[PDB]
From Swiss-Prot, chain C:
Disease implication from the record: Spinocerebellar ataxia 26: A form of spinocerebellar ataxia, a clinically and genetically heterogeneous group of cerebellar disorders. Patients show progressive incoordination of gait and often poor coordination of hands, speech and eye movements, due to degeneration of the cerebellum with variable involvement of the brainstem and spinal cord.
Summary of the function given for this chain in its UniProt record: Catalyzes the GTP-dependent ribosomal translocation step during translation elongation. During this step, the ribosome changes from the pre-translocational (PRE) to the post-translocational (POST) state as the newly formed A-site-bound peptidyl-tRNA and P-site-bound deacylated tRNA move to the P and E sites, respectively. Catalyzes the coordinated movement of the two tRNA molecules, the mRNA and conformational changes in the ribosome.
Cross-link (Glycyl lysine isopeptide (Lys-Gly) (interchain with G-Cter in SUMO)): K138
Modified residues (Phosphoserine): S141
Residue numbers bearing the Phosphotyrosine modification: Y81
Localization annotation: Cytoplasm; Nucleus
Protein name: Elongation factor 2
UniProt: GTP binding residues: S42, G43, L44
N6-acetyllysine PTM sites in chain numbering: K61, K88, K91
Organism of derivation: Homo sapiens
Family the entry assigns: Belongs to the TRAFAC class translation factor GTPase superfamily. Classic translation factor GTPase family. EF-G/EF-2 subfamily.
UniProtKB/Swiss-Prot annotation, chain D:
Keyword Transcription: no
Organism, scientific name: Homo sapiens
Miscellaneous comment as given in the Swiss-Prot or TrEMBL entry: This gene has no introns in its coding regions, and therefore was most likely produced by retrotransposition of the original X-linked gene during evolution.
Assembly, per entry: Component of a male germ cell-specific 60S large ribosomal subunit (LSU), which contains RPL10L and RPL39L, instead of RPL10 and RPL39 paralogs. The composition of the rest of the complex is similar to classical ribosomes.
Highest taxon, organism lineage: Eukaryota
Tissue specificity annotation: Almost testis-specific. Also expressed in pre- and postmenopausal ovary.
Annotated disulfide bonds: none
PANTHER family found in the cross-reference section: 60S RIBOSOMAL PROTEIN L10
Keyword GTP-binding recorded: no
Gene, per the UniProt record: RPL10L
Alphabetical GO biological process terms: cell differentiation; male meiosis I; ribosomal large subunit assembly; spermatogenesis; translation
Protein name as catalogued: Ribosomal protein uL16-like
Swiss-Prot record, chain E:
Residue list for modification N6,N6,N6-trimethyllysine: K22
Native source organism of the sequence: Homo sapiens (Human)
Gene that produces this protein: UBA52
General function of this protein: Component of the 60S subunit of the ribosome. Ribosomal protein L40 is essential for translation of a subset of cellular transcripts, and especially for cap-dependent translation of vesicular stomatitis virus mRNAs.
Modification after translation: Trimethylation of Lys-22 ('Lys-22' of the mature chain) by SMYD5 promotes translation elongation and protein synthesis.
Protein name per the record: Large ribosomal subunit protein eL40
Domain of life: Eukaryota
Localization, UniProt: Cytoplasm
Species lineage: Eukaryota, Metazoa, Chordata, Craniata, Vertebrata
From Swiss-Prot, chain F:
Residues of the full protein shown: 5 to 200 of 317
Self-association and partners: P0 forms a pentameric complex by interaction with dimers of P1 and P2. Identified in a IGF2BP1-dependent mRNP granule complex containing untranslated mRNAs. Interacts with APEX1. Interacts with FMR1 isoform 6.
Protein's name in the database: Large ribosomal subunit protein uL10
Organism lineage: Eukaryota, Metazoa, Chordata, Craniata, Vertebrata
Organism: Homo sapiens (Human)
A Gene Ontology term for the protein's cellular component: postsynapse
Subcellular localization(s) per the UniProt record: Nucleus; Cytoplasm
GO biological process, alphabetically ordered: cytoplasmic translation; ribosome biogenesis; translation
Length: 134, 190, 161, 205, 52, 196
RNA sequence: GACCCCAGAAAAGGUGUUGGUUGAUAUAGACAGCAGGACGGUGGCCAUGGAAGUCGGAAUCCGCUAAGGAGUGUGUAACA
């Protein structure tokens, strides 16, 4: 299994946290990182969505790589500092992009709907950039 | 409102025959003979065919309450047919937290002794109804088998055992001990 | 046997989670009846036993003596089944015939104790007598006269001190 | 220290209003008669529901306050604080007296003011709620709950009028269209086809 | 130490029931009205409270 | 809105039959919404799956029977939990990919078990706090290397018996593959034909 | 239960039964039972010690769909 199975996720983001986080609690799953490993893991992840950062990690026996899955609430709150249709569009390309979709137009509807947290009349009479993404 | 006619028909299998004496149904099958009279209900019972043996129950000019007796009679007769062909078999599980419940089957399966229910010295003696035989199954550690031809007698015997093992002056949600009817099936499993 | 196994497992998980590893300074902490680190019996009646005692009496029925007692323990406990009719050990739950076989713990450790308990509690004078001779136990006066549960206490106390 | 309402249930006396002859009357317990969005326009709340008494009796000001609060809390829960407007259409103008016993006996027995009640007739409206169409079931339930605060027997009615106006809901909208009605706050103003033509020229322009 | 399967069996007869709020009667779990005359067959029923 | 939903379904099935002349009738097993979406994505490129009420289908086919005959062969066949999949490709390519994209469905408690499963005698790799589940099943385990180990094979679930809750939690605990099943092709319709 | 005065009763209830009013669903398959599914974004936002549909304040969307509430209740510290 790639000599290690540490695919368990993490639900911290923004501040480094370290001791205040749940990483000391869930550390014994790999038993390698501890206080040093979760610090170097969070050092690269402090940017790139300073929000809750629901992230997934892989361990290389001393260091970790922390890929951040593209959660809609994560990216919309991060790209916020308005239509910003081109900004959300360019964020929907590197995504997992499955969405049980039929066209690429369905994905921009999904996250235009997610950003309703008004941006709903766009979904109603949408005609622009339907096949612009692919 | 009084309905002109409310009727229902049951079908009698080949191996069992039904004889009528007015409102007294006699159901005779391979497993024995059952009798039950419905003289407390004013209905018209009739045997329809020599080919397929249909029994028809009619109620003429019945109100709401006495239209409910047509299905009741038909279901009682179907239980009679079921008893004389397959029989009735009620299984009982004895459950206990600490004290095992000891069940001893006395003469010919007619008397049931419950010894150590909740750990008390009193011995319960429950007599089965006539025509009902109790036994201890060899498939489960704590299981009783009640067998008989009349569903009314078999389930009443099972309820006699169930109500005998009753916890008193305690919280019955916590003290769950006793013997309970686990499943209601037949014999010969057809 | 199942009750004994659940308790042994529960103690093992306690001393494995909160305890240190096997490679720790102490070594192995987990208890196993095959090692003889766990006993059974009743302190009120004054009788107790281990796998050690029953291995000793079956070796006698059958240094080098200590070695033969030790490997007998590994056969008295576990999911290994002793055929009564054949009279030999086995690893399979079923016999070649297909009969379900009792495990070694129940068949040749719990069975003598259950036979002793059943005979005394049912007041089978002849069965208790022959069981005493087969188990070659000594019975002094003032205690041979008593019967019932006190007789069970006296018998078990010397058979399994 | 109030008597049971069964002692003042019936309209046995003549009306006894608070006037220059009846002085020393304590204030009625009910002071608020309109709740919810009283400022809502006439066309916002086209549905009207009434609680209508079937008994010629007296309802205490205490009971009107209790039923007003009971209907208000349910309407707020099921419709929001601005989804309705309630109007209590009974005012406690009749003073009931008490002959207070510790002179002794029935000598000089005329009593002092004790409280106020409203005199209600058969078919008279006690309480009204106006709201949107989709809240009809909530109005019926709110008025049903408020019935339990009253002594007699009351019926819940859904009026054919539009809101709190006196015009039928099936001709309200086209009367507004042809300028027979003009909104003014919660109600409408009926403009007849007579008067100075300058008022007519104010309309149609 | 009742096993869960037997524990559910006993709770079918001891715990999984409804209670009349007026006369405390023990009713079947699917009851909508009390079966007893002394409360007037009221529909005011509550679940029998669990030891949980 | 229900009437418009029914009429929209009738327009959907009629147009889809007109466009696609080749289709499978497929009976749905106990397949979840995840399972149907997994099939829908696997077939999204070239095929289309339509499921719905049998009475919806049968009424629509009878109405379209006069416009397009030879559909009456489907009429004494659309029974049970079934649906259609429409494709312009060949029978074998549809069939073998639809049998290749199966799913290891988890063992749900309270469901019959078509398959017989038996746990191997191996270290589970789970922490020594999940022992309670093994004790409920009666499985004798021991702690080796600081993790739970199964000492011997235990026959867990037989064929055609109800899966208990304790077994279901244990299957979802060890993540081992339980009985697995998907949608199975009842029959075919190749421009008015019946095969297996 | 049983006849003016008159010699005892109310609010409120009833899936007892009887009649009436209004409305709704249904051979495009009602209702009830038994049997399957009850999904993705998304462990949606703000709240915090933890609230992942289910203590709460607002919002109440989209795609796949036969259908599945960013949730009716049970339950969990939260999950499950
Ligand atoms: Mg029946
Ligand atoms: Mg007590
Ligand atoms: Mg008083
Ligand atoms: Mg007067
Ligand atoms: Zn009651």
């Amino acid at each position: 299994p790639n000599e290690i199975k540490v695919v368990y996720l993490r639900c911290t983001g923004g501040e480094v946290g370290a001791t205040s986080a749940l990483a000391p609690k869930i550390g014994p799953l790999g038993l390698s990182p501890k206080k040093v490993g979760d610090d170097i893991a969070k050092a690269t992840g402090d940017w790139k969505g300073l929000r809750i950062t629901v992230k997934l990690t892989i361990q290389n026996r001393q260091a970790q790589i922390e890929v951040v899955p593209s959660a809609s609430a994560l990216i919309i709150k991060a790209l916020k500092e308005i239509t910003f249709d081109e900004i959300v569009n360019i964020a929907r390309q590197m995504r997992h992009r499955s969405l049980a979709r039929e066209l690429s137009g369905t994905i921009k509807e999904i996250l235009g709907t997610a950003q309703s947290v008004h941006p709903h009349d766009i979904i109603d009479d949408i005609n622009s950039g339907a096949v612009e993404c692919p | 409102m009084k309905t002109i006619l409310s009727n229902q028909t049951v079908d009698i299998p080949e191996n069992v025959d039904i004889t009528l004496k007015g409102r007294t149904v006699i159901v005779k099958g391979p497993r024995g003979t059952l009798r039950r009279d419905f003289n407390h209900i004013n209905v018209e019972l009739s045997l329809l065919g020599k080919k397929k043996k249909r029994l028809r129950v009619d109620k003429w000019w019945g109100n709401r309450k006495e239209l409910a007796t047509v299905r009741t009679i038909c279901s009682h007769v179907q239980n009679m047919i079921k008893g004389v062909t397959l029989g009735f078999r009620y299984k009982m599980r004895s459950v206990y937290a600490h004290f095992p419940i000891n069940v001893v089957i006395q003469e010919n399966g007619s008397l049931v002794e419950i010894r150590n229910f909740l750990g008390e010295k009193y011995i319960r003696r429950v007599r089965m109804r006539p025509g009902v035989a109790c036994s201890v199954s060899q498939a489960q550690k704590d299981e009783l088998i009640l067998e008989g031809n009349d569903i009314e007698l078999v389930s009443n015997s099972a309820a006699l055992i169930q109500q005998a093992t009753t916890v008193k002056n305690k919280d019955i949600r916590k003290f769950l001990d006793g013997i309970y009817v686990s499943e209601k099936g037949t014999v010969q499993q057809a | 046997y199942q009750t004994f196994q659940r308790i042994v497992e529960n103690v093992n998980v306690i001393i494995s989670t909160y305890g240190e590893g096997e490679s720790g300074p102490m070594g192995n902490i987990m208890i196993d009846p095959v090692l003889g680190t766990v006993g059974f019996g009743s302190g009120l009646h004054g009788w107790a036993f281990t796998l050690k005692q029953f291995a000793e009496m079956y070796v006698a029925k059958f240094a080098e003596r200590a070695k033969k007692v030790e490997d007998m323990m590994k056969k008295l406990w576990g999911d290994r089944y002793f055929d009564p009719a054949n009279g030999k050990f086995s690893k399979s739950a079923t016999s070649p015939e297909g009969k379900k076989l009792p495990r070694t713990f129940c068949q040749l450790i719990l069975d003598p104790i259950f036979k002793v308990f059943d005979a005394i509690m049912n007041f089978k004078k002849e069965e208790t007598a022959k069981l005493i001779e087969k188990l070659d136990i000594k019975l002094d006066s003032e205690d041979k006269d008593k019967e019932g549960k006190p007789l069970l206490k006296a018998v078990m106390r010397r058979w399994l001190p | 220290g109030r008597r049971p309402a069964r002692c003042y249930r019936y309209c046995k006396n003549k009306p006894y209003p608070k006037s220059r002859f009846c002085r020393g009357v304590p204030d009625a317990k009910i002071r608020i008669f309109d709740l919810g969005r009283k400022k809502a326009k006439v066309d916002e709340f086209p549905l009207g529901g009434h609680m209508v008494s079937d008994e010629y009796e007296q309802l205490s000001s205490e009971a009107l306050e209790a039923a007003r609060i009971c209907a208000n809390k349910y309407m707020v829960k099921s419709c929001g604080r601005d989804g309705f407007h309630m109007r209590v259409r009974l005012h406690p103008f009749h003073v009931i007296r008490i002959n207070k016993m510790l002179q002794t006996g029935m000598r000089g027995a005329f009593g002092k003011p004790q409280g106020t009640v409203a005199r209600v007739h058969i078919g008279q409206v006690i309480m009204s709620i106006r709201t949107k169409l989709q809240n009809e079931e909530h109005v019926i339930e709110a008025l049903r709950r408020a019935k339990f605060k009253f002594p007699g027997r009351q019926k819940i009615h859904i009026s054919k009028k539009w809101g709190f106006t006196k015009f039928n809901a099936d001709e309200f909208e086209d009367m507004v269209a042809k300028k027979c009605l003009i909104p003014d706050g919660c109600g409408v103003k009926y403009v007849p086809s007579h008067g100075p033509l300058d008022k007519w020229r104010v309309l149609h322009s | 130490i009742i096993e869960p399967s037997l524990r559910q069996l006993a709770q079918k007869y001891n715990c999984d029931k409804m209670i009349c709020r007026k006369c405390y009667a023990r009713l079947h779990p699917r009851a909508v009205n009390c079966r007893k005359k002394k409360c007037g067959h009221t529909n005011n029923l509550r679940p029998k409270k669990k030891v949980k | 809105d229900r009437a418009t939903w029914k009429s929209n379904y009738f327009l959907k099935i009629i147009q889809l039959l007109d466009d696609y002349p080749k289709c499978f009738i497929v009976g749905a097993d106990n397949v979840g919404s995840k399972q149907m979406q997994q099939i829908r994505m696997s077939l999204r490129g070239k095929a289309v799956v339509l499921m719905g009420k049998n009475t919806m289908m049968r009424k629509a086919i009878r109405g379209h029977l006069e416009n397009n005959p030879a559909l009456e062969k489907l009429l004494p066949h659309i029974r049970g939990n079934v649906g259609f999949v429409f494709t312009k490709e060949d029978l074998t390519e549809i069939r073998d990919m639809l049998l290749a994209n199966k799913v290891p469905a988890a063992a749900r408690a309270g469901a019959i078990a078509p398959c017989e499963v038996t746990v191997p005698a191996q270290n589970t790799g789970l922490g020594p706090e999940k022992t309670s589940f093994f004790q409920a099943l009666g499985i004798t385990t021991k702690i080796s290397r600081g993790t739970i180990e199964i000492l011997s094979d235990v026959q867990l679930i037989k064929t055609g018996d109800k899966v208990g809750a304790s077994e279901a939690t244990l299957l979802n605990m060890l993540n081992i593959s339980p009985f697995s099943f998907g949608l199975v092709i009842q029959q075919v319709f190749d421009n008015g034909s019946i095969y297996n």
